[PDB]
């Protein structure tokens, strides 16, 4: 249940939070880009023509981190005499306001087919969704035609407060048909064999299936929903991940959704240990919290391993997941906490 209109039509989002790179006139300023609104001369329209160069855009500041799962666009209806609209567009979002990223769907496509007339509202299912603070719409024109936008953002608040998670690149198991357990949508960097500075499949609200080879999404490879690693690749015997949060929080629990199809190599982690850091010092808040999982479990259905975190206050987390079988498969990792 994460599809609430975030405020354009609604008015929650104030003019001050809606900028743009230029308006044709003051009758077509950013403030007029609210979905279903007639303010100004119908909507927002770039000043300069969106020539082969695609640099014009509308920007929306949501203030707090949000999981945007959808967007709706519209054209300049203006009473009924409006005849302009954006046929297609690209999206860029940001969390810290300095580092921007381009949205690309699960199948590598950046462009989003937009409107067909000025009136109608076209909705777009952002798969994968984006965790953002700021969102930019870059109107697209393929010929010299006057574009205009009117937008809406759907989703919900990002209450987890997870800014990013570090982790080893996803490996692949060669099993009859190659299974790719890499983080497919990670929106950060990936130097060496390590991902950092971003978010991906482990934090997208999608949980994997019991059989990790088959997924709920279409046109994707086997293993898509998961991010897994193999025991033999890590002499230490555990996968290590570091998590950074928006603010100082009291951690109640951590929840990992894992695959337990031991028939193919995947078993729940043997145990889970996490260290906490509140930020300033270069030291860990205290002794770590090691949690062992009763046993290996009979049934192969994926389950949600819940780790108690003692309500320990901190802003950085460094957990380790002990292997219990040849492989370890995760499809999601959630944190339950309260801001102190």
């Amino acid at each position, epitope marked *: 249940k994460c599809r609430y209109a975030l405020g354009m039509q609604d008015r929650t989002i104030p003019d001050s939070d809606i900028s743009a790179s230029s308006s044709w006139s003051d009758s077509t300023a950013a403030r007029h880009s609210r979905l279903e609104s007639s303010d100004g001369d119908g909507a927002w329209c770039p000043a300069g023509s969106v020539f082969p160069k695609e640099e014009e855009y509308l920007q929306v500041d949501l203030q707090r981190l949000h999981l945007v799962a959808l967007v709706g666009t519209q054209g300049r209806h203006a009473g009924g005499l409006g005849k302009e609209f954006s046929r297609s567009y690209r999206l860029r979002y940001s969390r810290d306001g300095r580092r921007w990223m381009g949205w690309k769907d699960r199948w590598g496509q950046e462009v989003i087919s937009g409107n067909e007339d000025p009136e109608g509202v076209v909705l777009k299912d952002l798969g994968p969704p984006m965790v953002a603070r700021l969102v930019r719409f870059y109107p697209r024109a393929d010929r010299v035609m006057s574009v205009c936008l009117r937008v809406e953002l759907y989703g919900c608040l990002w209450r987890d407060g997870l800014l990013s998670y570090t982790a080893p690149v996803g490996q692949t198991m060669y099993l009859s048909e190659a299974v790719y357990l890499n983080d497919s949508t990670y929106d950060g960097h990936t130097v060496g064999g390590l991902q950092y500075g971003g978010l991906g499949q482990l934090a997208d609200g999608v949980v994997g299936l019991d059989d990790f080879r088959k997924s709920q999404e279409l046109r994707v490879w086997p293993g898509y929903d998961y991010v897994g690693w193999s025991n033999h690749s890590f002499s230490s015997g555990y996968v290590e991940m570091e998590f950074e949060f928006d603010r100082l929080r*009291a951690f*109640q*629990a951590m929840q990992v959704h894992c695959n337990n199809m031991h028939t193919l190599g995947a078993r729940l982690p043997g145990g889970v240990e996490c260290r906490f850091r509140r930020g300033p010092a270069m030291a860990w*808040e*205290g*002794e770590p919290m090691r949690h062992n999982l009763g046993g290996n479990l009979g049934d192969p259905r994926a389950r949600a391993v*819940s780790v*108690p975190l*003692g*309500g*320990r*206050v901190a802003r950085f987390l460094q957990c380790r997941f002990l292997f219990a079988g040849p492989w370890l498969l995760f499809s999601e990792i959630s944190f*339950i906490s309260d801001a*102190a």
Partner: antibody
Amino acid sequence: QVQLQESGAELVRPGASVKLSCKASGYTFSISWINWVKQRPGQGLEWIGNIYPSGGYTNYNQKFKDKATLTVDKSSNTAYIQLSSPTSEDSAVYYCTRGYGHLDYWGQGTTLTVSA
Amino acid sequence: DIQLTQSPALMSASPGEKVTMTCSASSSVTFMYWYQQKPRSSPKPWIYLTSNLASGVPARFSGSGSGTSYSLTISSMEAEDAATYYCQQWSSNPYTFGGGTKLELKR
């Protein structure tokens, strides 16, 4: 041995200031939450609020917003719960307990009697 | 403000029977915790994070559910299981307790 030792009884005249103690030991005191739950004989349990030593962060149950105040002497590993103006109903058994969600350890509780 | 309702409020069972109480929350909570108490004693943690058995807790027990419904099941009721059980929510202040299911034994 995680221990939350606390006085067995406490007596005070109505309206008079009373302070219940809870000395902890057996684990890093500063980084665990200390909670206080209230219970009148044969009745249910009521969570008053907690305090996280290292930081002083607190959480009160609106209901005791103006009745209680939690503090902690991060020196003797003790946690306190103050009651400003005692009133019979404010007399029952008070338990200090460690944890945030999973309340893993409980003290023996203090029997507080508001009486002349 | 998210109050829990436990059913049965009071119930008895015969030895070896499979008892099972319930905790219903006016609202959704990420987890449910269960504590056990016997007259003139401190409650003990029985189950945490919905289904984890607290230390010392015998195998006979288990817990589960989600959203607004939850439950504490006892595989095979023994004599010592005779007590009052309280569930608790920690998804929102004030972290309230349920009314408590008083479990009496038959013999």
